Amino acid sequence: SNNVKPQVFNPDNVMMHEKKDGTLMNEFTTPILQEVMENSKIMQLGKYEPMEGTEKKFTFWADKPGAYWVGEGQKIETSKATWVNATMRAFKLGVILPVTKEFLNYTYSQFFEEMKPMIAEAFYKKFDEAGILNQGNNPFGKSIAQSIEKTNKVIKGDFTQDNIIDLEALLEDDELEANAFISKTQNRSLLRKIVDPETKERIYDRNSDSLDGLPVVNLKSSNLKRGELITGDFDKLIYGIPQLIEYKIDETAQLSTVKNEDGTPVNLFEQDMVALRATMHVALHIADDKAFAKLVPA
Amino acid sequence: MEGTEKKFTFWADKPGAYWVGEGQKIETSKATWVNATMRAFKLGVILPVTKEFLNYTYSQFFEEMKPMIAEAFYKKFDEAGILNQGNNPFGKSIAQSIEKTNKVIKGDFTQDNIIDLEALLEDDELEANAFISKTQNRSLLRKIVDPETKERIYDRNSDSLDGLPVVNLKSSNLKRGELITGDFDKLIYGIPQLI
Amino acid sequence: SNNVKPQVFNPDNVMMHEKKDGTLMNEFTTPILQEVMENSKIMQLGKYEP
Amino acid sequence: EYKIDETAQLSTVKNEDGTPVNLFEQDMVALRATMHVALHIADDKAFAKLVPA
Amino acid sequence: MEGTEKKFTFWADKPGAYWVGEGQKIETSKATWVNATMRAFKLGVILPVTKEFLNYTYSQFFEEM
C-alpha cells in the first residue's frame, strides 16, 4: 500500500516516535519524576502469610477444656476442646504497555526499565484501595471498610480528643487494642488543632506523625474523605503473594484491546511493535471483623 | 541557565492497572509526560549626570549609586513575581496562581485562620515552607493566642510563625490585612546576566 | 473492565484453575489411567517402510 | 513433534464475546502436536469382509 | 545520522554595500540564513513459508533468501 503516514490507534495507548502532524521526536529529553514512588499501605500494616497455592486455610483453637472440684473418691467429670476454620484466596492484577519499535530506538531506549517502578506502584495502589476502602472494584468480599459496615463500629462526630479516645476504646470493648491509624493527609490540619484541656498536651505529634502514641499511615486515595479516620488491630489483617510482579516483554502477540484506524486489532510482529505485560497474584484476609473502627463526620 | 530559556519535562500520568479474571483479556494503559518552559526578561535603568556635578559636587557618585540600583532591580523582580505588580512581564506570578486556583481565606488574623491557611495547601499534598508578610502585620500577628494553652504562635525572637520563617516585603501593594503561604521550592528562578 | 469471574470459552477446550462457581482447584490429584492405552493396529499388522 | 507456545492466537476457540483467543493478552499457553504419516495398500485383492444379512 | 532526522543551516542573502559621498550617511543591511532537513523512512517485507516447505523442499530457504 506504500502508506507512510503514521498509524492512528484507538485507544491512543501506543507510544510513538512520529506525530500525526509530521513531527518526528528525535533529541528527546527523558522525563523526570516530581514525586517519590508509593508503596502498599496494606503490605506495610498487615501480616505477611507465606502462600503457595492460590488459597490458604487457617485453623484456630476455640473452646477450651474445663475443670472440676472433686471430693475424695468422687467421680471426675469430662471436658472437650474445639477449633474453628477460615480461608483466603488470591486474585490477579495485570497491565499491558504497547510501544512502537521506532520509539524504543529513536526516542526512549530505556522506556520499560523506567516504567517498571511505575507499574509496581500502580499495582500496590490498586491493592490498597481494594483491601482498605472497598473501592476500585474490590474482587474479594473482604475489606476493612466492609468489616466496619457489618459491625457498625462507627463514631459520628468531629475530631476531638473525646471522639478519638472513644474510638480507640471501641476496640477494647471487644478485647482488642489499636496498633495504628489510617488517615488522609488533608486532615492532619484537624489533628494539629486539638489539645487536652486539662494536661494541656497535644494528642498529635506533628513532628513524628503519631496520634495518641500510635503511628499514623497516610493514604493517597481520594476516596477517604477529609473528616474520616480509621483505627484497628492491623495484626488481624493478613496478606499473601502467590506470584510476585512478573514482566514479559513480547514482540509478536496480538492486542485485541487496541485497534488500528481501519478497525483491525494491533499485531505486534506485522506492525513492528513491542509490548510489556506485567502480572501479580495477591491475596487478602481480614482475620477478625471486629478489629477495626471508624470516625466519620456528622 | 545558559540562555534566555529553560525547558522541563515531567511525568503527568502513571499507567493504570486492572483486576483480571482467569483467562480474561489484560487491558492496556499509557504513561504521559508534560512540558513546561521558563524565559528571561531584561531590567534596566539609565542615570544621567552633568560633568560639573561629577567633578565638583560628588566624585564617587556612580560607585556609591551601584548598590541602590541593585536594590531597585531586586524590588522590581520581587514586586512582579510575588505580586502581579510593577507591570509584570512574565505570564504568571504567585498572585496569578492564587487568583486562578482561588486558594484564598476571607478573615481576620486568628490561630484558626492561620492554621486553615496552611491547611489549604495540604488539600493538594503540598507542605508549606514559609510565609510572605508585610511588617505592619506584626501588630496583628503578636495579638494571636491559643485559647487553651495560651501559647502564642508568632515568635518575636526569630520572626517565625507557627514554626515557619516569615519573610517581609517592603511594598505598598501587599496591604495591611494580607498574608501569603507557599511551598516556595515551587518558585524557580534564574539569572542569565548578572547586573 | 475489572471483571474477575473466569472466562467462558467455546467450544470450551481450555483447562482452567477456577470453576465458574468459584471453586479453586488447588491440592489437585493427578489423574490415573483406568486402561492400557492402544497401539496402532495398522502399525502392528502392516509393514514399515523408511 | 511438540511445540509449546505462549503468544499465538487460536481462531478455532472463541471468547464469550465472540473474539478469537489471544494467548498473550489472556495469559495462556498452548501445546501443538503434529505428525506426518503415510499409507499404501500394496494389493487391493488381499482383503475380505464378512457382514450381517 | 543519529536519530532519523538531520538539519542543515545555510547562509542565504548577503549584505549590501553603498557608494558614500564625503560626509554622507552610510546605510545598513543584514545577513540571512535558511534551513533544510532530511528524514528517514522504513523499508520492509515479510516472506511467509509453510513448515512442510521448510522441512521437505528447501531447508536453507531463509539463509539463501
Measured CA distances, A241 to A210, A245, C27 (Å): 29, 9, 18
C-alpha cell at C9: 470459552
C-alpha cell at B101: 486556583
The contacts of residue B59 (CB under 8 Å, 6+ apart) are none
CA A274/CA A265 separation, integer angstroms: 14
Distance of CA C29 to the CA centre of its chain: 14
Cβ-Cβ pairs closer than 8 A, A with D, add up to 28
CA E13/CA E16 separation, integer angstroms: 9
- Is A253 in Cβ contact with D7 (below 8 Å)? yes
Nearest by Cα to A189 from A165, A220, A158: A158
Cβ-Cβ pairs closer than 8 A, B with C, add up to 28
The percent of chain E in helix, strand and coil, each rounded to the nearest 5, is: 15, 20, 60
Whether chains B and E touch (3+ CB pairs under 8 A) is answered by no
B21 touches chain D (CB under 8 A): no
- Is B17 in Cβ contact with A279 (below 8 Å)? no
Nearest by Cα to C20 from C9, C36, C32: C9
The minimum CA-CA distance between D1 and chain C, rounded to whole Å, is 18
The minimum CA-CA distance between C31 and chain A, rounded to whole Å, is 19
- Burial class of residue B168 in the structure, from the number of CB atoms within 10 Å of its CB (0-12 exposed, 13-18 middle, 19+ buried): middle
Whether chains C and E touch (3+ CB pairs under 8 A) is answered by no
CA A249/CA B19 separation, integer angstroms: 20
Helix (H) or strand (E) segment spanning residue A14: none
- Which DSSP symbol is given to A63? S
C-alpha cell at A136: 476500585
The reported resolution of this PDB entry, expressed in Å, is 3.1
Instruction: Catalogue the long-range contacts made by A199-202 (C-beta closer than 8 Å, 24 or more residues apart).
Output: A200/B148, A200/B149
CA A200/CA A194 separation, integer angstroms: 10
- Which DSSP symbol is given to D48? -
Nearest by Cα to A7 from A270, A262, A275, A268: A262
B63 touches chain A (CB under 8 A): no
Which chain A residue shows the shortest CA-CA distance from D21? A256
CA B188/CA B7 separation, integer angstroms: 12
Torsion from C-alpha of B98, B99, B100, B102, nearest 10 degrees? 70
Measured CA distances, A174 to A74, A157, A170, A216 (Å): 39, 22, 7, 22
Is residue B141 a contact partner of residue B160, using CB atoms and an 8 Å limit?
no
Residue E24, classed as helix, strand or coil, is: coil
Q: Please, which chains are in contact with C (at least 3 CB pairs closer than 8 A)?
A: A, B, D
The DSSP bridge pattern shows strands A265-267 and A254-260 to be: antiparallel
- Is B125 in Cβ contact with A220 (below 8 Å)? yes
Distance of CA A287 to the CA centre of its chain: 17
The contacts of residue B18 (CB under 8 Å, 6+ apart) are A93, A94, A95, A126, B26, B27, C1, C2
Give the phi and the psi of residue E52 in degrees, each rounded to 5.
Answer: -55, -50
Phi/psi region, residue B110 (left: phi>0; alpha: psi -120 to 50; beta: rest), is beta
Nearest by Cα to A288 from A84, A147, A134: A147
- Is D22 in Cβ contact with A253 (below 8 Å)? yes
CB < 8 Å to B27, chain C: 1
E strands, chain A, where?
9-10, 47-48, 55-61, 83-100, 154-156, 180-184, 204-205, 210-211, 214-219, 229-232, 237-250, 254-260, 265-267, 273-286, 292-296
- Interface-testing mutation among A26, A104, A268, with chain E (most E C-beta atoms within 10 A): A26
Whether chains E and A touch (3+ CB pairs under 8 A) is answered by yes
CA A58/CA A22 separation, integer angstroms: 61
CA A99/CA A13 separation, integer angstroms: 9
Name the structure determination technique: cryo-EM
CA A73/CA A64 separation, integer angstroms: 26
Is residue B40 a contact partner of residue B1, using CB atoms and an 8 Å limit?
yes
- Is D28 in Cβ contact with B25 (below 8 Å)? no
- Burial class of residue B169 in the structure, from the number of CB atoms within 10 Å of its CB (0-12 exposed, 13-18 middle, 19+ buried): middle
Is residue B39 a contact partner of residue B2, using CB atoms and an 8 Å limit?
no
C-alpha cell at A101: 519499535
- DSSP symbols for chain B: --SSEEEEEEEEE----EEE-TTPPPPB---EEEEEEEE-----------HHIIIII-TTHHHHHHHHHHHHHHHHHHHHHTSS-SS--SS--HHHHHHHHT----S-S-HHHHHHHHHHHHTTT----EEEE-GGGHHHHTT---TTT---SEEGGGTEETTEEEEE---SSS-TT--EEE-GGG-----SS--
Distance between first and last Cα of chain A: 67
Q: Please, which chains are in contact with D (at least 3 CB pairs closer than 8 A)?
A: A, B, C
User: What b/e readout covers C13-25, taking b as 16+ CB neighbours within 10 angstroms?
Assistant: ebeeebeeeeebe
C13 touches chain B (CB under 8 A): no
CA A147/CA A285 separation, integer angstroms: 11
- Is B23 in Cβ contact with C9 (below 8 Å)? yes
Nearest by Cα to D11 from B85, A296, A254: A254
Is residue A187 a contact partner of residue A227, using CB atoms and an 8 Å limit?
yes
Helix (H) or strand (E) segment spanning residue E40: none
Using alpha carbons only, give the angle B157, B111, B125 rounded to the nearest 5 degrees.
100
- Is A26 in Cβ contact with E5 (below 8 Å)? yes
The contacts of residue A36 (CB under 8 Å, 6+ apart) are none
Measured CA distances, A50 to A53, A89, A282, C15, D3 (Å): 10, 12, 11, 26, 34
CA C31/CA B70 separation, integer angstroms: 89
Give the phi and the psi of residue B55 in degrees, each rounded to 5.
Answer: -80, -50
**Residue among C9, C11, C49 whose CB faces D15 most closely:** C9
- Burial class of residue B134 in the structure, from the number of CB atoms within 10 Å of its CB (0-12 exposed, 13-18 middle, 19+ buried): buried
The percent of chain A in helix, strand and coil, each rounded to the nearest 5, is: 20, 35, 45
B46: which strand partners?
A: none
CA A229/CA A216 separation, integer angstroms: 10
Q: Please, which chains are in contact with A (at least 3 CB pairs closer than 8 A)?
A: B, C, D, E
C-alpha cell at D10: 487460536
Helix (H) or strand (E) segment spanning residue E10: strand E5-11
Is residue D15 a contact partner of residue C11, using CB atoms and an 8 Å limit?
no
Residues 25-44 in C contacting A (C-alpha not used; CB under 8 Å): 26-27
- Interface-testing mutation among D7, D16, D27, with chain A (most A C-beta atoms within 10 A): D7
Instruction: Catalogue the long-range contacts made by B118-122 (C-beta closer than 8 Å, 24 or more residues apart).
Output: B118/A189, B118/B162, B118/B181, B119/A186, B119/A189, B120/B181, B121/B181, B121/B182, B121/B183, B122/A185, B122/A186, B122/A188, B122/A189
- Burial class of residue A61 in the structure, from the number of CB atoms within 10 Å of its CB (0-12 exposed, 13-18 middle, 19+ buried): exposed
The minimum CA-CA distance between C21 and chain A, rounded to whole Å, is 14
C-alpha cell at E10: 545555510
